[PDB]
C-alpha cells in the first residue's frame, strides 16, 4: 500500500517543539489578553491553536488579520521588549470591565490605553523610537472606535481623533469610526489593532490626537523565521513523529496520505480520497 490512511489519536510533542495555546489564539497571546500569560517567553516550532479558544478582553478586529497571525507564527517566539514611552499629560493604563482579570477590570498587558487627563487635556503626542539594535522590532498598536460622539469627547476631548504611525518609508493614519455596534462582551465600542515592523537603523513615530491604544514595547523578530501554526482540537500526547495534521500525527514510511490537506513537517504528500496498491 502506498497511501497511508491511519493517523495517531494525538499530536506528538517530539521531536518538534509544540506549544499549546489552550484558551488563547496566537493573536490574544501577542496582545496579552487574560489567560494568555502562559505563552510569555514561549518558543515553538509549531504553535497549536485550539478552535475552542475564546476572546478574553476588549472586542477587537484586525485589518489584514491573517497576515499578523502568520507573522506571529512564522517568528516562533514571544520575546517582549518593554520600553518607556513619555506620554505627556494624558492618562495611562486604561482598564475595561469587558477585560476582567480576577474579577478586576484590566486590559491587554502589552497595550496602554491613553485617556484624556483630569484637566480635560489631550495634547498632541509625537514620540519617536529609534531601532539602534541588531534585530527587527514588531510594534502592535490599536485605534479605539467609540459608540457615540459623546463617548469620543468624554475619552479624548478631541473629535475626531487621529492615530498616525510612520516609519522612514511608510505611514499609516487612521481616523476613528464612531457608531454603536452590536453588543459584544457588554460593549458597543471596538478597537482596531495594527502592526509595524521596524528594521535595525529605522525609526518609528507614534503621532495621535486621540483614540490611541499605545504599545508598551515591542517583540523580538528572529532573523530566521521557520516556525508555523496548526489550528486543531487534537490533544498533545507522548508519541514520536515529525509529521502533524489537524486530525493528528502520522508515523509512516508511505509516500502518500489521504488523511488531511493540512500537514506540517516531515509529512507524505497529500492525495485526494481513495487508496490502492501496486
Amino acid at each position: 500500500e502506498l497511501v497511508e490512511s491511519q493517523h495517531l489519536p494525538e499530536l506528538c510533542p517530539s521531536p518538534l517543539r509544540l506549544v499549546d495555546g489552550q484558551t488563547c489564539d496566537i493573536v490574544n497571546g501577542a496582545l496579552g489578553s487574560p489567560g494568555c500569560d502562559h505563552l510569555n517567553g514561549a518558543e515553538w516550532d509549531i504553535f497549536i491553536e485550539r478552535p475552542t479558544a475564546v476572546d478574553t478582553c476588549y472586542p477587537f478586529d484586525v485589518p489584514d488579520y491573517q497576515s499578523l497571525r502568520s507573522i506571529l507564527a512564522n517568528n516562533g517566539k514571544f520575546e517582549f521588549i518593554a520600553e518607556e514611552f513619555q506620554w505627556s499629560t494624558v492618562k495611562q493604563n486604561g482598564k475595561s470591565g469587558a477585560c476582567k482579570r480576577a474579577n478586576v477590570n484590566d486590559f491587554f498587558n502589552r497595550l496602554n490605553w491613553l485617556t484624556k487627563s483630569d484637566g480635560n487635556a489631550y495634547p498632541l503626542q509625537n514620540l519617536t523610537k529609534i531601532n539602534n539594535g541588531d534585530y527587527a522590532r514588531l510594534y502592535i498598536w490599536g485605534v479605539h472606535h467609540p459608540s457615540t460622539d459623546t463617548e469620543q469627547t468624554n475619552l479624548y476631548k478631541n473629535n475626531p481623533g487621529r492615530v498616525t504611525v510612520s516609519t522612514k518609508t511608510s505611514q499609516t493614519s487612521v481616523v476613528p469610526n464612531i457608531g454603536s455596534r452590536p453588543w459584544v462582551r457588554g460593549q458597543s465600542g471596538r478597537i482596531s489593532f495594527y502592526w509595524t515592523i521596524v528594521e535595525p537603523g529605522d525609526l518609528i513615530v507614534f503621532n495621535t490626537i486621540g483614540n490611541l491604544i499605545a504599545p508598551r514595547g515591542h517583540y523580538k523578530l528572529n532573523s530566521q523565521k521557520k516556525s508555523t501554526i496548526l489550528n486543531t482540537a487534537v490533544p498533545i500526547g507522548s508519541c514520536v513523529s515529525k509529521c502533524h495534521t489537524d486530525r493528528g500525527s502520522i508515523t509512516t514510511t508511505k509516500p502518500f496520505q489521504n488523511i488531511s490537506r493540512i500537514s506540517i513537517g516531515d509529512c507524505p504528500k497529500y492525495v485526494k480520497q481513495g487508496s490502492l496498491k501496486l
Partner: antibody
Amino acid sequence: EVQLVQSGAEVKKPGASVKVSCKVSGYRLTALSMHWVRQAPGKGLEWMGGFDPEEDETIYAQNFQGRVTLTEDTSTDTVYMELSSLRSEDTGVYYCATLMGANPFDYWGQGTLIIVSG
Amino acid sequence: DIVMTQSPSSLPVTPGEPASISCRSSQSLLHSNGYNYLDWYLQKPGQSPQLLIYLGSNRASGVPDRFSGSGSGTDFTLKISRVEAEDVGVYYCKQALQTLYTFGQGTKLEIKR
C-alpha cells in the same frame, strides 16, 4: 483499472472555443485529481493545468493566459477542458491524465486532436 | 518554475546494449520524506504517455526489470540493461514536488546505424 476516455476529434476555425471531455470509468472523480497536457506535433509535452489536492483549487498554468477553463461534472464523472481564443499554434493532441504528483495513480487518455485550421 | 534539462537529446543505441538518460532539475526534488518526487515517462510512437519509473527509482507496474532509475536532489538517471525494439520512443521526466509540473524536452531513442 481506471479508464480515461476522451471525446472525439474536434476541428474549429481560428478564434472559436473547443470543449474536450474526459470520462472516468473505474473510479469516482470525487476522489481523483485531473490534469491536462498538450503536445504540439513534432515537439514535446507541455503542461496546461489541473487540480492540486493540497490548497484544494484547480490550478491553471498562467502561460496559457487563462484561456483554459477546467470544469468537472461529478455526476457523469467527466472533466471538461475549454480553450478559448484559438490560434494557429494551438493545434495538437490534448491529453487528460491523473498525474502521479497529485494522485497515487498515473493513467492517461487517448487524446483529443484539435485542428484549428479553418 | 523548476527547469528540467534532459541529456542527451538524441540517444542512438544498439539493441542488446545498455543506455542512460540523465534528467537534471533546477531545484532539489527531495522532500523531507526522503522520497524524491520525480517520475519517468515513455511516449511510444503514436501512443499516449506511459509511466516507467515512479518516485525516483521505484519501477512502475508491469514495467520490465530491464528498466531502472537512480539519482537524488537535482541529478537523476534512467537506465536500461538490454534495450530492445519494444523500448523505442521518447522519454520524459516529470517533477512531482511542485504541482506546477514541468516536463523535460524528451530524449529520442533511435537505433544505431
